[PDB]
Amino acid sequence: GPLGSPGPNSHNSNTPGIREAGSEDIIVVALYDYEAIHHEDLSFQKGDQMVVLEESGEWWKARSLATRKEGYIPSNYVARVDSLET
């Protein structure tokens, strides 16, 4: 009788830590202390920095750079770091 020995050849695909690009991080400093006045809102302090991710209109969804939290924050209560003067 004949004979045969099995043995497949597993494979896979995936790229490593390919170079990065396309940055984006709107940093805004709280112009005034905020403790989530209304629902759906993040709480911060006057001088706290947040990473604005989404900016629908006024309130933007930034992540507190203190607790790495995530929630909507008032723009009228923040000021882009690159929007500071003297």
């Binding site: 005034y32 905020y34 209304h38 629908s56 309130w59 969804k61 909507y72 009228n76």
Partner: peptide, 12 residues
Amino acid sequence: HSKYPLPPLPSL
């Protein structure tokens, strides 16, 4: 999210 006409600006 634009739901409220921004919060009431404080003093300092």
